[PDB]
Tab-separated table of C-alpha atoms (C1' of nucleotides) and ligand atoms in Angstrom:
chain	number	residue	atom	x	y	z
A	1	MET	CA	-27.245	48.455	51.429
A	2	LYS	CA	-26.759	49.223	47.953
A	3	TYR	CA	-30.597	49.622	46.330
A	4	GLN	CA	-33.275	51.368	48.154
A	5	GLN	CA	-35.907	50.231	49.617
A	6	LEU	CA	-39.398	51.092	48.406
A	7	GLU	CA	-42.563	49.831	50.702
A	8	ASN	CA	-45.416	50.400	48.170
A	9	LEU	CA	-43.215	48.470	45.663
A	10	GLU	CA	-42.097	45.530	48.148
A	11	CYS	CA	-45.127	45.016	49.656
A	12	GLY	CA	-46.974	44.798	45.853
A	13	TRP	CA	-44.114	42.607	45.323
A	14	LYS	CA	-44.771	40.224	48.287
A	15	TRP	CA	-47.662	40.379	47.588
A	16	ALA	CA	-48.405	38.984	44.296
A	17	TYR	CA	-45.613	36.628	45.332
A	18	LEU	CA	-47.737	35.003	47.744
A	19	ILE	CA	-50.953	34.594	45.608
A	20	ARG	CA	-48.930	32.883	43.189
A	21	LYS	CA	-47.780	30.955	45.417
A	22	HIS	CA	-50.490	29.913	47.205
A	23	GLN	CA	-52.424	29.606	43.008
A	24	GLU	CA	-49.602	27.399	42.890
A	25	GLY	CA	-50.710	25.212	46.230
A	26	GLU	CA	-47.908	26.400	48.715
A	27	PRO	CA	-48.959	26.423	51.710
A	28	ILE	CA	-48.734	29.781	52.583
A	29	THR	CA	-49.583	30.525	56.400
A	30	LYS	CA	-48.363	28.327	59.341
A	31	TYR	CA	-52.021	26.658	60.121
A	32	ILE	CA	-52.311	22.817	59.225
A	33	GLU	CA	-56.030	22.585	60.144
A	34	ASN	CA	-57.733	24.105	56.398
A	35	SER	CA	-60.652	26.641	58.264
A	36	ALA	CA	-57.347	29.168	59.339
A	37	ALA	CA	-55.728	28.627	56.672
A	38	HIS	CA	-58.056	29.016	54.129
A	39	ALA	CA	-59.560	31.975	56.524
A	40	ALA	CA	-55.903	33.570	56.877
A	41	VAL	CA	-55.853	33.050	53.044
A	42	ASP	CA	-59.031	35.235	52.363
A	43	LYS	CA	-58.025	37.885	54.795
A	44	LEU	CA	-54.864	38.050	52.593
A	45	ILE	CA	-57.199	38.078	49.108
A	46	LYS	CA	-59.379	40.672	50.590
A	47	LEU	CA	-56.004	42.530	51.805
A	48	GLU	CA	-54.199	44.055	48.350
A	49	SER	CA	-54.181	47.137	47.851
A	50	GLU	CA	-52.236	47.481	51.211
A	51	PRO	CA	-48.842	47.447	52.409
A	52	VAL	CA	-48.692	48.307	55.844
A	53	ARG	CA	-51.080	45.903	56.773
A	54	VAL	CA	-49.898	42.705	54.393
A	55	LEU	CA	-46.361	43.500	56.315
A	56	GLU	CA	-48.001	42.733	59.585
A	57	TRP	CA	-50.230	40.040	57.640
A	58	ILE	CA	-46.735	38.167	56.872
A	59	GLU	CA	-45.615	38.592	60.436
A	60	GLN	CA	-48.362	37.074	62.149
A	61	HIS	CA	-49.299	33.703	59.849
A	62	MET	CA	-46.310	33.343	56.940
A	63	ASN	CA	-45.151	29.896	56.553
A	64	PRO	CA	-42.147	29.999	58.767
A	65	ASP	CA	-40.083	27.674	55.741
A	66	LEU	CA	-40.863	29.991	53.302
A	67	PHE	CA	-39.397	33.306	54.760
A	68	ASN	CA	-35.609	32.906	53.547
A	69	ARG	CA	-37.048	31.734	49.732
A	70	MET	CA	-39.503	35.159	49.827
A	71	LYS	CA	-36.753	37.364	51.090
A	72	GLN	CA	-33.841	36.393	47.901
A	73	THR	CA	-36.719	36.579	45.844
A	74	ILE	CA	-37.368	40.175	47.222
A	75	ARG	CA	-34.153	40.463	46.939
A	76	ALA	CA	-33.631	39.383	43.203
A	77	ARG	CA	-36.685	41.266	42.281
A	78	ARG	CA	-35.145	44.553	43.185
A	79	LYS	CA	-31.792	44.058	42.388
A	80	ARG	CA	-33.230	43.383	38.648
A	81	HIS	CA	-35.745	46.336	39.190
A	82	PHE	CA	-32.996	48.745	39.784
A	83	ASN	CA	-30.681	47.059	36.867
A	84	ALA	CA	-33.397	46.749	34.049
A	85	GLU	CA	-33.132	50.980	34.164
A	86	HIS	CA	-30.047	50.823	31.456
A	87	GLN	CA	-29.026	49.149	29.210
A	88	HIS	CA	-25.499	48.023	30.810
A	89	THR	CA	-26.446	46.626	33.716
A	90	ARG	CA	-28.936	44.978	32.079
A	91	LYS	CA	-28.325	40.959	31.808
A	92	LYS	CA	-27.916	38.846	28.974
A	93	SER	CA	-29.585	34.987	29.649
A	94	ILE	CA	-29.145	32.648	26.572
A	95	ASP	CA	-28.892	28.683	26.275
A	96	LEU	CA	-25.883	26.917	25.659
A	97	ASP	CA	-25.469	22.676	24.689
A	98	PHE	CA	-24.266	20.870	27.316
A	99	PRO	CA	-20.537	19.903	25.982
A	100	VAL	CA	-20.024	23.748	25.516
A	101	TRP	CA	-21.210	24.812	29.028
A	102	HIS	CA	-19.632	21.571	30.247
A	103	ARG	CA	-15.966	22.717	28.958
A	104	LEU	CA	-16.597	26.918	29.686
A	105	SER	CA	-17.722	26.427	33.588
A	106	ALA	CA	-14.141	23.874	33.368
A	107	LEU	CA	-12.351	26.971	32.792
A	108	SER	CA	-14.143	29.326	34.897
A	109	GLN	CA	-13.435	26.802	37.979
A	110	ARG	CA	-10.277	26.611	36.497
A	111	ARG	CA	-9.656	29.830	36.666
A	112	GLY	CA	-11.239	31.103	39.642
A	113	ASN	CA	-13.496	33.808	37.251
A	114	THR	CA	-16.795	34.109	36.599
A	115	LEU	CA	-18.828	32.763	33.416
A	116	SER	CA	-18.266	36.519	32.756
A	117	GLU	CA	-14.889	37.107	32.779
A	118	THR	CA	-13.819	34.050	31.820
A	119	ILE	CA	-15.782	34.589	28.415
A	120	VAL	CA	-13.974	38.199	28.097
A	121	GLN	CA	-11.015	37.292	28.773
A	122	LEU	CA	-11.277	34.479	25.749
A	123	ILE	CA	-12.126	36.209	23.524
A	124	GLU	CA	-9.924	39.019	24.248
A	125	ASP	CA	-6.635	36.995	23.630
A	126	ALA	CA	-8.875	35.593	20.200
A	127	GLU	CA	-8.436	39.462	19.692
A	128	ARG	CA	-5.283	39.275	20.702
A	129	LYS	CA	-4.450	36.517	18.345
A	130	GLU	CA	-5.440	37.463	14.954
A	131	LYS	CA	-3.596	40.395	15.907
A	132	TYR	CA	-0.638	38.358	16.253
A	133	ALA	CA	-1.057	36.748	13.274
A	134	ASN	CA	-2.328	39.900	11.413
B	1	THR	CA	-12.785	9.395	51.590
B	2	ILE	CA	-11.347	7.274	48.742
B	3	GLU	CA	-12.026	3.968	50.956
B	4	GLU	CA	-15.541	5.570	51.558
B	5	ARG	CA	-16.283	6.299	48.011
B	6	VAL	CA	-15.031	3.099	46.815
B	7	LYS	CA	-18.327	1.567	49.402
B	8	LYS	CA	-20.421	4.529	47.870
B	9	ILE	CA	-19.933	3.354	44.119
B	10	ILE	CA	-19.954	-0.166	45.228
B	11	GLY	CA	-22.624	-0.671	46.987
B	12	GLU	CA	-24.690	2.082	44.406
B	13	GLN	CA	-23.456	0.716	41.248
B	14	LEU	CA	-24.093	-3.211	42.585
B	15	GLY	CA	-27.567	-2.347	44.482
B	16	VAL	CA	-25.947	-4.296	47.907
B	17	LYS	CA	-25.898	-3.415	51.282
B	18	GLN	CA	-22.891	-1.072	52.568
B	19	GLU	CA	-22.721	-3.918	55.651
B	20	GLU	CA	-22.271	-6.065	52.881
B	21	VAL	CA	-19.469	-4.424	51.010
B	22	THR	CA	-16.518	-4.896	53.041
B	23	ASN	CA	-13.018	-4.867	51.914
B	24	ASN	CA	-12.081	-8.454	51.300
B	25	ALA	CA	-16.132	-8.497	49.310
B	26	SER	CA	-15.658	-10.411	46.057
B	27	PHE	CA	-17.641	-8.732	43.389
B	28	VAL	CA	-18.871	-11.454	41.644
B	29	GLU	CA	-19.846	-14.632	44.524
B	30	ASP	CA	-20.175	-11.539	47.289
B	31	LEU	CA	-22.154	-8.978	45.517
B	32	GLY	CA	-23.249	-11.146	42.781
B	33	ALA	CA	-21.946	-8.501	39.989
B	34	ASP	CA	-22.180	-10.569	36.993
B	35	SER	CA	-19.467	-9.544	33.582
B	36	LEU	CA	-21.557	-6.654	32.605
B	37	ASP	CA	-22.294	-5.269	36.380
B	38	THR	CA	-18.635	-5.906	36.745
B	39	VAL	CA	-18.063	-3.929	33.986
B	40	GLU	CA	-20.563	-0.926	35.005
B	41	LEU	CA	-18.643	-1.012	38.048
B	42	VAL	CA	-15.456	-0.237	37.028
B	43	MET	CA	-16.492	2.388	35.043
B	44	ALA	CA	-18.273	4.204	37.751
B	45	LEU	CA	-15.002	3.795	39.795
B	46	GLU	CA	-13.007	5.838	36.663
B	47	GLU	CA	-15.802	7.884	36.721
B	48	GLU	CA	-15.688	8.972	40.309
B	49	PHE	CA	-11.749	9.659	40.775
B	50	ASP	CA	-11.257	11.022	37.004
B	51	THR	CA	-8.883	8.505	36.101
B	52	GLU	CA	-8.442	5.582	33.395
B	53	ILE	CA	-7.052	2.398	33.726
B	54	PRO	CA	-5.436	-0.353	31.740
B	55	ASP	CA	-7.699	-3.029	30.064
B	56	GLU	CA	-6.242	-6.163	31.724
B	57	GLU	CA	-4.673	-4.207	35.401
B	58	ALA	CA	-8.621	-3.347	35.621
B	59	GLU	CA	-9.606	-6.798	34.466
B	60	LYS	CA	-7.099	-7.842	37.272
B	61	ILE	CA	-9.220	-6.152	39.765
B	62	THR	CA	-11.656	-8.576	41.431
B	63	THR	CA	-12.386	-7.711	44.766
B	64	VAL	CA	-13.456	-4.539	47.530
B	65	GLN	CA	-9.835	-4.758	48.312
B	66	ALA	CA	-8.310	-5.047	44.783
B	67	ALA	CA	-10.898	-2.242	44.135
B	68	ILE	CA	-8.675	0.666	46.795
B	69	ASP	CA	-5.596	-1.240	46.240
B	70	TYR	CA	-5.727	-0.068	42.568
B	71	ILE	CA	-7.451	3.158	43.533
B	72	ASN	CA	-5.460	3.998	46.598
C	1	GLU	CA	1.372	16.338	13.466
C	2	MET	CA	1.299	15.432	16.193
C	3	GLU	CA	-0.290	17.832	18.203
C	4	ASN	CA	-2.838	17.867	15.231
C	5	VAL	CA	-3.673	14.044	15.617
C	6	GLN	CA	-3.915	14.304	19.752
C	7	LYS	CA	-6.843	16.368	18.654
C	8	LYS	CA	-8.767	14.232	17.360
C	9	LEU	CA	-7.630	11.819	19.811
C	10	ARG	CA	-8.813	14.490	22.464
C	11	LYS	CA	-12.829	14.953	20.591
C	12	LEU	CA	-12.862	10.903	20.739
C	13	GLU	CA	-12.114	11.042	24.393
C	14	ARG	CA	-14.701	13.799	25.252
C	15	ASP	CA	-17.141	11.133	23.242
C	16	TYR	CA	-16.434	8.289	25.170
C	17	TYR	CA	-16.622	10.367	28.398
C	18	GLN	CA	-19.796	11.401	27.435
C	19	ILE	CA	-21.204	8.038	26.272
C	20	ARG	CA	-19.196	6.456	30.105
C	21	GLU	CA	-20.970	9.020	32.141
C	22	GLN	CA	-24.500	8.565	30.526
C	23	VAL	CA	-24.322	4.280	30.961
C	24	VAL	CA	-23.124	4.598	34.526
C	25	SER	CA	-25.828	7.188	35.436
C	26	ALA	CA	-28.400	4.716	33.637
C	27	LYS	CA	-26.643	1.966	36.106
C	28	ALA	CA	-27.098	4.144	38.724
C	29	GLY	CA	-30.957	4.395	38.388
C	30	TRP	CA	-31.295	1.046	37.511
C	31	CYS	CA	-29.831	0.098	40.939
C	32	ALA	CA	-31.842	2.218	42.389
C	33	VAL	CA	-35.659	1.384	40.953
C	34	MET	CA	-34.541	-1.925	41.706
C	35	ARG	CA	-33.801	-1.249	45.138
C	36	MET	CA	-36.866	0.670	45.840
C	37	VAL	CA	-39.244	-2.528	44.339
C	38	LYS	CA	-38.409	-5.100	47.156
C	39	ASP	CA	-41.331	-4.770	47.357
C	40	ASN	CA	-41.362	-8.113	45.740
C	41	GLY	CA	-43.475	-6.194	42.444
C	42	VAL	CA	-40.675	-6.716	40.465
C	43	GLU	CA	-40.170	-10.267	39.506
C	44	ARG	CA	-42.605	-10.657	37.099
C	45	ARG	CA	-44.522	-8.181	37.483
C	46	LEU	CA	-42.722	-5.985	36.767
C	47	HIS	CA	-40.514	-7.324	34.440
C	48	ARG	CA	-42.472	-8.646	31.270
C	49	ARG	CA	-40.031	-10.580	28.846
C	50	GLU	CA	-42.393	-10.410	26.316
D	1	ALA	CA	-73.607	-6.609	47.749
D	2	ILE	CA	-73.449	-8.013	44.467
D	3	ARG	CA	-72.895	-4.851	42.442
D	4	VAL	CA	-70.759	-3.521	45.134
D	5	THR	CA	-68.008	-6.789	44.587
D	6	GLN	CA	-68.054	-6.653	41.378
D	7	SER	CA	-67.623	-2.985	41.806
D	8	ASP	CA	-64.517	-3.150	43.171
D	9	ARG	CA	-62.985	-6.116	41.523
D	10	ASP	CA	-63.304	-4.354	37.816
D	11	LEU	CA	-61.109	-1.815	39.517
D	12	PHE	CA	-58.942	-3.975	40.850
D	13	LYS	CA	-59.035	-5.727	37.931
D	14	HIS	CA	-58.435	-2.381	35.404
D	15	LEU	CA	-56.241	-0.356	38.382
D	16	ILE	CA	-53.941	-3.283	38.515
D	17	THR	CA	-53.468	-3.840	34.368
D	18	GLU	CA	-52.844	-0.475	33.761
D	19	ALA	CA	-50.696	-0.003	36.325
D	20	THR	CA	-48.875	-2.557	34.753
D	21	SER	CA	-48.909	-1.874	30.555
D	22	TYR	CA	-47.884	1.911	32.002
D	23	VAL	CA	-44.359	0.905	33.704
D	24	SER	CA	-43.210	-2.567	32.478
D	25	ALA	CA	-43.010	-1.016	29.214
D	26	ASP	CA	-40.674	2.199	29.738
D	27	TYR	CA	-38.845	-0.329	32.219
D	28	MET	CA	-38.379	-2.803	29.557
D	29	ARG	CA	-37.434	0.446	26.953
D	30	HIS	CA	-34.733	1.759	29.395
D	31	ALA	CA	-33.005	-1.562	30.198
D	32	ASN	CA	-32.931	-2.406	26.260
D	33	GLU	CA	-31.237	1.178	25.662
D	34	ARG	CA	-28.599	0.747	28.578
D	35	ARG	CA	-27.515	-1.890	27.160
D	36	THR	CA	-27.414	-0.482	24.286
D	37	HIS	CA	-25.755	2.185	25.142
D	38	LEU	CA	-22.920	-0.275	27.187
D	39	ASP	CA	-22.466	-2.049	23.696
D	40	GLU	CA	-21.401	1.018	21.843
D	41	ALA	CA	-19.381	3.045	24.357
D	42	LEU	CA	-16.937	-0.544	24.266
D	43	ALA	CA	-16.072	0.021	21.379
D	44	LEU	CA	-14.874	3.771	21.846
D	45	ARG	CA	-13.253	2.606	24.605
D	46	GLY	CA	-10.918	0.095	23.034
D	47	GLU	CA	-10.118	2.655	20.120
D	48	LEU	CA	-9.541	5.296	22.904
D	49	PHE	CA	-6.816	2.811	24.255
D	50	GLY	CA	-4.500	2.519	21.546
E	1	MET	CA	-41.266	14.227	11.914
E	2	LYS	CA	-38.167	13.880	14.074
E	3	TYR	CA	-39.677	14.072	17.190
E	4	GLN	CA	-42.943	10.832	17.923
E	5	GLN	CA	-46.152	12.767	18.629
E	6	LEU	CA	-47.805	11.112	21.679
E	7	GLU	CA	-51.719	12.051	21.820
E	8	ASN	CA	-52.097	11.460	25.644
E	9	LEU	CA	-49.304	13.582	26.516
E	10	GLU	CA	-50.093	16.455	24.284
E	11	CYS	CA	-53.685	16.872	24.872
E	12	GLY	CA	-52.906	17.333	28.773
E	13	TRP	CA	-49.564	19.522	27.868
E	14	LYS	CA	-52.472	21.177	25.570
E	15	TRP	CA	-54.581	21.526	29.044
E	16	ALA	CA	-52.224	22.972	31.410
E	17	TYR	CA	-51.322	25.640	29.011
E	18	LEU	CA	-54.913	26.595	28.471
E	19	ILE	CA	-55.642	26.519	32.214
E	20	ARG	CA	-52.575	28.450	33.262
E	21	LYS	CA	-53.022	30.846	30.660
E	22	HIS	CA	-56.605	31.677	32.229
E	23	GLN	CA	-55.491	31.749	35.591
E	24	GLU	CA	-52.731	34.281	34.606
E	25	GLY	CA	-55.891	36.089	33.195
E	26	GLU	CA	-56.085	36.120	29.302
E	27	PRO	CA	-58.998	35.672	26.971
E	28	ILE	CA	-58.204	32.077	25.847
E	29	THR	CA	-61.669	32.308	24.841
E	30	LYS	CA	-62.990	33.389	21.484
E	31	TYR	CA	-66.116	34.834	23.270
E	32	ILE	CA	-67.079	38.296	24.334
E	33	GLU	CA	-69.820	37.511	26.467
E	34	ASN	CA	-68.942	36.684	30.069
E	35	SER	CA	-71.614	33.808	30.436
E	36	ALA	CA	-70.910	31.663	27.338
E	37	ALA	CA	-66.870	32.411	27.976
E	38	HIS	CA	-66.939	31.295	31.743
E	39	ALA	CA	-68.657	28.774	30.922
E	40	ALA	CA	-66.782	27.615	27.723
E	41	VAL	CA	-64.046	27.553	30.821
E	42	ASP	CA	-66.394	25.408	33.360
E	43	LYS	CA	-66.087	23.093	30.799
E	44	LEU	CA	-62.107	23.091	30.118
E	45	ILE	CA	-62.043	22.440	33.677
E	46	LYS	CA	-64.353	19.915	33.904
E	47	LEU	CA	-62.107	18.380	30.730
E	48	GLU	CA	-59.234	17.830	33.334
E	49	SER	CA	-59.237	14.069	33.376
E	50	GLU	CA	-60.288	13.730	29.574
E	51	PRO	CA	-57.212	15.381	27.567
E	52	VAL	CA	-58.837	13.813	24.467
E	53	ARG	CA	-62.316	15.857	24.247
E	54	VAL	CA	-59.244	18.723	24.886
E	55	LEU	CA	-58.850	19.254	21.254
E	56	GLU	CA	-62.832	19.470	20.731
E	57	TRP	CA	-63.030	22.039	23.372
E	58	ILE	CA	-60.141	24.069	21.045
E	59	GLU	CA	-61.739	23.375	17.767
E	60	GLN	CA	-64.935	24.874	19.593
E	61	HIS	CA	-64.131	28.391	21.737
E	62	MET	CA	-60.283	28.397	21.862
E	63	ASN	CA	-59.664	32.496	20.650
E	64	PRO	CA	-58.192	32.972	17.389
E	65	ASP	CA	-55.431	34.326	18.642
E	66	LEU	CA	-53.908	31.419	20.444
E	67	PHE	CA	-53.310	28.795	17.818
E	68	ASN	CA	-49.982	30.421	17.135
E	69	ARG	CA	-48.863	30.965	20.641
E	70	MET	CA	-50.315	26.925	21.552
E	71	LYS	CA	-48.236	25.301	18.663
E	72	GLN	CA	-45.228	27.178	19.459
E	73	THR	CA	-45.350	26.158	23.107
E	74	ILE	CA	-46.197	23.239	22.447
E	75	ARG	CA	-43.963	21.597	19.897
E	76	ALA	CA	-40.598	23.676	22.219
E	77	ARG	CA	-42.001	21.364	24.926
E	78	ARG	CA	-42.182	18.352	23.242
E	79	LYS	CA	-38.324	19.057	22.511
E	80	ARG	CA	-37.036	19.705	25.731
E	81	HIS	CA	-38.911	16.187	26.776
E	82	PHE	CA	-37.544	14.192	24.370
E	83	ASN	CA	-33.812	15.852	24.764
E	84	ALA	CA	-34.261	15.611	28.550
E	85	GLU	CA	-33.728	12.043	28.608
E	86	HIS	CA	-29.460	12.406	28.103
E	87	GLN	CA	-27.257	15.103	29.676
E	88	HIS	CA	-25.796	15.613	25.922
E	89	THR	CA	-28.882	16.536	24.567
E	90	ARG	CA	-30.288	19.220	26.977
E	91	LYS	CA	-29.323	22.795	27.451
E	92	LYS	CA	-27.894	25.109	30.056
E	93	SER	CA	-29.135	28.013	30.618
E	94	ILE	CA	-26.505	31.299	31.727
E	95	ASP	CA	-26.838	34.665	31.852
E	96	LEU	CA	-24.197	36.936	30.492
E	97	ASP	CA	-23.703	41.205	31.591
E	98	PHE	CA	-24.480	42.949	28.604
E	99	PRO	CA	-21.158	44.190	27.115
E	100	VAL	CA	-20.390	41.008	27.121
E	101	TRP	CA	-23.215	40.271	25.325
E	102	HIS	CA	-22.995	41.882	22.871
E	103	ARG	CA	-19.856	41.261	21.667
E	104	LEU	CA	-20.137	37.528	21.519
E	105	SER	CA	-23.306	38.675	19.171
E	106	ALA	CA	-21.527	40.454	17.279
E	107	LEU	CA	-19.103	38.195	16.879
E	108	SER	CA	-21.088	35.432	16.217
E	109	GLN	CA	-22.828	37.630	13.201
E	110	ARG	CA	-20.153	37.889	11.647
E	111	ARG	CA	-19.065	34.231	11.998
E	112	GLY	CA	-22.505	33.581	11.030
E	113	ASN	CA	-22.779	30.605	13.645
E	114	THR	CA	-25.299	29.966	16.625
E	115	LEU	CA	-23.856	31.077	20.171
E	116	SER	CA	-23.025	27.841	21.114
E	117	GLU	CA	-20.692	27.634	17.847
E	118	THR	CA	-19.082	30.763	18.243
E	119	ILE	CA	-18.201	29.673	22.133
E	120	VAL	CA	-17.104	26.106	20.952
E	121	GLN	CA	-14.450	27.725	18.364
E	122	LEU	CA	-13.417	30.302	20.668
E	123	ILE	CA	-12.761	27.492	23.396
E	124	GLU	CA	-10.825	25.549	20.844
E	125	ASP	CA	-8.368	28.191	19.907
E	126	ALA	CA	-7.858	28.717	23.854
E	127	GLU	CA	-7.524	24.843	23.864
E	128	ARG	CA	-5.308	24.951	20.816
E	129	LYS	CA	-2.205	27.583	22.371
E	130	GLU	CA	-2.705	25.467	26.088
E	131	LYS	CA	-2.272	22.061	23.613
E	132	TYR	CA	0.440	23.052	21.760
E	133	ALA	CA	1.890	24.755	24.959
E	134	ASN	CA	1.645	21.039	26.926
E	135	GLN	CA	2.741	19.226	23.595
F	1	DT	C1'	-25.021	36.045	62.885
F	2	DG	C1'	-28.506	38.111	59.175
F	3	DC	C1'	-29.139	41.413	55.705
F	4	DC	C1'	-27.641	41.965	51.355
F	5	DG	C1'	-25.867	41.859	46.310
F	6	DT	C1'	-24.314	38.835	42.929
F	7	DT	C1'	-23.851	34.697	40.626
F	8	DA	C1'	-25.479	30.592	38.006
F	9	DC	C1'	-28.077	27.827	37.295
F	10	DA	C1'	-33.636	25.354	36.056
F	11	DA	C1'	-38.904	25.481	33.734
F	12	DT	C1'	-41.556	27.934	30.769
F	13	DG	C1'	-43.426	30.318	27.376
F	14	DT	C1'	-42.565	33.542	22.401
F	15	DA	C1'	-40.448	35.485	17.747
F	16	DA	C1'	-37.347	34.249	14.402
F	17	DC	C1'	-35.698	31.361	11.436
F	18	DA	C1'	-34.516	26.686	8.425
F	19	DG	C1'	-35.772	22.823	6.752
F	20	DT	C1'	-39.187	18.879	5.439
F	21	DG	C1'	-42.757	17.211	3.034
F	22	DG	C1'	-48.058	17.710	1.154
G	1	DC	C1'	-47.545	26.733	-2.305
G	2	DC	C1'	-48.214	26.355	1.982
G	3	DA	C1'	-47.978	24.159	6.977
G	4	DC	C1'	-46.304	21.609	10.187
G	5	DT	C1'	-41.449	20.657	12.396
G	6	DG	C1'	-36.895	21.638	14.958
G	7	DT	C1'	-33.432	24.923	16.518
G	8	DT	C1'	-32.086	29.393	18.115
G	9	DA	C1'	-31.565	33.115	21.074
G	10	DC	C1'	-34.006	35.482	23.266
G	11	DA	C1'	-37.025	36.726	27.923
G	12	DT	C1'	-39.613	36.149	33.029
G	13	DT	C1'	-39.663	34.335	37.831
G	14	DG	C1'	-37.961	31.361	41.163
G	15	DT	C1'	-33.843	29.195	44.180
G	16	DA	C1'	-29.094	27.673	46.545
G	17	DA	C1'	-24.743	28.691	47.297
G	18	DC	C1'	-21.204	32.071	48.429
G	19	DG	C1'	-18.882	36.489	50.189
G	20	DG	C1'	-18.656	41.400	52.171
G	21	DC	C1'	-20.266	43.703	56.389
G	22	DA	C1'	-22.990	46.125	60.712
H	201	PNS	P1	-20.124	-10.356	30.095
H	201	PNS	O1	-19.923	-12.299	30.402
H	201	PNS	O2	-21.156	-10.471	29.664
H	201	PNS	O3	-19.188	-9.901	29.300
H	201	PNS	C1	-18.607	-8.796	28.987
H	201	PNS	C2	-17.086	-8.019	28.301
H	201	PNS	C3	-16.108	-8.588	29.123
H	201	PNS	C4	-17.281	-9.636	27.167
H	201	PNS	C5	-17.196	-7.624	27.555
H	201	PNS	O4	-17.620	-6.338	28.860
H	201	PNS	C6	-16.027	-6.524	27.269
H	201	PNS	O5	-15.154	-6.212	27.883
H	201	PNS	N1	-16.169	-6.282	25.688
H	201	PNS	C7	-14.659	-6.362	25.300
H	201	PNS	C8	-14.053	-7.245	25.275
H	201	PNS	C9	-12.816	-6.860	24.564
H	201	PNS	O6	-11.358	-6.406	25.307
H	201	PNS	N2	-12.612	-5.999	22.979
H	201	PNS	C10	-11.275	-5.138	22.600
H	201	PNS	C11	-11.753	-3.835	22.469
H	201	PNS	S1	-13.671	-3.606	21.644
DNA sequence: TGCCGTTACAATGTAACAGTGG
DNA sequence: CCACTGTTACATTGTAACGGCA
């Protein structure tokens, strides 16, 4: 356990995620009958502003197949929330043309390094080549 | 494995049944693959195993058994 | 010098790989579609040569 | 009865014609570009080998 | 114009964009009154299966703020949709740590080329070393 | 094993720059 | 000039797959 978990924050995250999924059409609840599903969704909607009861709501009506996805989404949300405080711990997202990405991933898989490590090593070698020439 | 990756490629590049593609099943007569179809089959076989084949030695391949023989 | 030439050779190799993969993917998709239209909607209804 | 049957016939006709129009066009397109890409790829392959 | 503009597709894109924006809570309407805004949104909702009228609904009730974001988003969506046909024209999204990205962006701004071009030059120097080692 | 960090993506939205033609 | 388009460099959120550890 590296990042401390805060209930009033992660519960709001879970509520927002479930509301988003419901608005997206995902079946939040395990009830195939539409009446029970709608009733549970209404309970959730009126359940806003409550961690201790949204957790119970999840335990009681949550769709079995979404547990893993919700858990990993909350994991990622927690990690990003804690890393977004400092500049050096943040992550920069870019888009690479498919050939360039293909070659870079080929190198990374070949050497066992990650994309960041592979690019760092390559840049260091480029600098070393510059110094060699210079 | 190679001997079943060959069937995977042949069936999904010619659309014929897995049962149809036996070792001795010739492409043109059994599987029905014509000029361009056989060209695409050999191209896919090249792509699967990330290798290259000579033109003449490739065109010599005209059967599942020959295909595997050159692949393995 | 030979290395310099092999650089262009490798460039052409990458180009050929790209084109071959594209064509192979297209053929695989076409075959899958043909096998999904075994419902007899393809003989004339889908294949309008006009 | 006449109204219902006419509506059914019109709906069937329109649906079928529009679905065929929507699908066959892209199908023929994909076929044409597949042929063109194969033609393009052969020359690259031939040059590469030598 | 490099990408063909299709009306019945861009209209659907625009309608989906408006609906998504509204359900996110933003004021797509130009109306400050609640009743007129609600009526305009309801009419837009009715316009789901008629993308052609969506252009007119835009000209009548779309918030003046959104022209730039609208014209940006649909343009980008068109580019991506037409590039997605072939792999070699697609784009790949990757994430980089701040130190690594900082160094890479500084190098690229030094060389005056895009990130992909800088990576191409870098990987090409590495591959030149590999090639010379191989010969 | 199940949780927890971590990576490498995918999909969509925006700001900013560079081109193009009216 | 001005508008509209193409492109790059991000952000934002979600997900699957590894691998560490109780
Ligand atoms: P199918 O009867 O359409 O025949 C296709 C083909 C065998 C002619 C074609 O795939 C092909 O091989 N074309 C190139 C022939 C050749 O060897 N050219 C030299 C290199 S460009």
